[PDB]
């Protein structure tokens, strides 16, 4: 029905039957990687382009409009990607973010899932303009998953992820959750985040 979409990063697969497409962020592709700031010593690690999971929050009926839960995308990763962060000085990668909020079609409300570069705590008034960033909505009547793909962007061509987090996954309540007698009491929100086009540069000494 074109509503079934399968995303396959690395050897991991995520299939959704209520897709509304993919939002391609600020660019449909990556910029140039072999810049003059790495002297050609950058290399690509394809073993880190996999899906990893994280719990965001429990969307309940008490949360009003403007409730923001954030997740700085370079996070405490326990797999190959975290090993790369601990073993290389400089790194760059885009993100492929899927956010799932599974209730049932008898619930109301709407979540705004957005990727914000260089996140700063938004004031109350600024939350009304949060759609300026790459985003999708999640509404139980229509879809259970939002899928956003963003490139690497920042001041520097390579970042030190222990000093700077370019991206932040912002989920905000737009309309409060509505629950009837037959709907879900609450909706738990999870993420499938996959680094894309991972490049590393600068080999660090062994940690003892």
């Amino acid at each position, epitope marked *: 029905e074109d509503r079934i979409l399968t995303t396959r990063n690395g050897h991991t697969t995520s299939t959704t039957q209520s897709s509304v497409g993919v939002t391609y962020g600020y660019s449909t592709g990556e910029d140039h990687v072999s810049g003059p700031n790495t002297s050609g010593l950058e290399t690509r690690v394809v073993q880190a382009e996999r899906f990893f999971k994280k719990h965001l929050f429990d969307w309940t009926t008490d*949360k009003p409009f403007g409730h923001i839960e954030k997740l700085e995308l370079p996070t405490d990763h326990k797999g190959v990607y975290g090993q790369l962060v601990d073993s290389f000085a400089y790194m760059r990668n885009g993100w492929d973010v899927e956010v799932s909020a599974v209730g049932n079609q008898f619930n109301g409300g709407c979540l705004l899932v957005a990727m914000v570069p260089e996140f700063k*705590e938004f004031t109350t008034r600024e939350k009304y303009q949060l759609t300026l960033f790459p985003h999708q909505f999640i509404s139980p009547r229509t879809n259970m998953t939002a899928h956003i793909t963003v490139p690497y962007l920042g001041v520097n061509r390579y970042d030190q992820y222990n000093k700077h987090k370019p991206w932040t996954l912002v989920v905000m309540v737009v309309s409060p959750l509505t629950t009837s007698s037959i709907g879900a009491s609450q909706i738990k929100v999870y993420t499938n985040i996959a680094p894309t086009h991972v490049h590393v540069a600068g080999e660090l000494p062994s940690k003892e």
Partner: antibody
Framework: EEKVVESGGGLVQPGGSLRLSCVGSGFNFKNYEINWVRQAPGKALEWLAYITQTSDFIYYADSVKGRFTISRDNSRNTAYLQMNNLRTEDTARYFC????????????????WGPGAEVVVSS | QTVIQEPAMSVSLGGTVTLTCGFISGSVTGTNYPSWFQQTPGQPPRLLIYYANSRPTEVPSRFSGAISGNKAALTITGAQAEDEADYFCCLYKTNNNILFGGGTHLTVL
């Protein structure tokens, strides 16, 4: 070990003002929500106030609206509950609680509880 | 007041007891997000049940919760000697009001 330690209690006269501190350790204090619950001796628990992770939303119980003010300092890992115009019925054991656990991320968790600060208000 | 909870219940050692928590007027559902706490004297309350179905990992599997008969229910299977305490029922009703139960003083015989 995620634990919450609170102090600042004592004996004050009615109509006075005091501030209760709430120092948390073992967790990122900025990533969790703080609830204040008081329990009078021989009575049940009573929820007083609630503050979010960035002070975006603040809620007070209908019986303590206006008199009490809640604030938090994420840098110092400390939560504050300022009480003004204390009444004779405010004598209770005040608890500073952290809302949130592994499978529960909302205000309905109420997982970590402090030892409790004794506040006695009498003439 | 608002929330009705049994003042005290008696259960034999190793037995099964069910506690009742509900409203004076209305039905308790998942939207109220029932929570249960255990408080031995001289001790801070301990969380037992949240969302009326889940149990913290540290809490033993003896304590279980459910919604039955439009009221929040806490079930203890195979009561031990450490289950004698005050059990409180927490219910959500609007953001500015959080309701606590009267408190059941469970006594293990």
């Amino acid at each position: 070990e995620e634990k919450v330690v609170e102090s600042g209690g004592g004996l004050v006269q009615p109509g006075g003002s005091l501030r209760l501190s709430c120092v948390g350790s073992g967790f990122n204090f900025k990533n969790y929500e703080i609830n204040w619950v008081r329990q009078a001796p021989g009575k049940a628990l009573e929820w007083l106030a609630y503050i979010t992770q960035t002070s975006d939303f603040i809620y007070y119980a209908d019986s303590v609206k206006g008199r009490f003010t809640i604030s938090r300092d994420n840098s110092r890992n400390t939560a504050y509950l300022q009480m003004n115009n204390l009444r004779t019925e405010d004598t209770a054991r005040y608890f500073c609680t952290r809302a949130g656990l592994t499978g529960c991320k909302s205000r309905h968790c109420m997982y970590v509880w402090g030892p409790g600060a004794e506040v006695v208000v009498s003439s | 007041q608002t929330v009705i909870q049994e003042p005290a219940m008696s259960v034999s050692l190793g037995g099964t007891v069910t506690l009742t928590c509900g409203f004076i007027s209305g039905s308790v559902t998942g939207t109220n997000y029932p929570s249960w706490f255990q408080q031995t004297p001289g001790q801070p309350p301990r969380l037992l049940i949240y969302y009326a179905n889940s149990r913290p990992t540290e809490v033993p599997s003896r304590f279980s919760g459910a919604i039955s008969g439009n009221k929040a229910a806490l079930t203890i299977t195979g009561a031990q000697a450490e289950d004698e305490a005050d059990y409180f029922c927490c219910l959500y009703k609007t953001n500015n009001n959080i309701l606590f139960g009267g408190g059941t003083h469970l006594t293990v015989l």
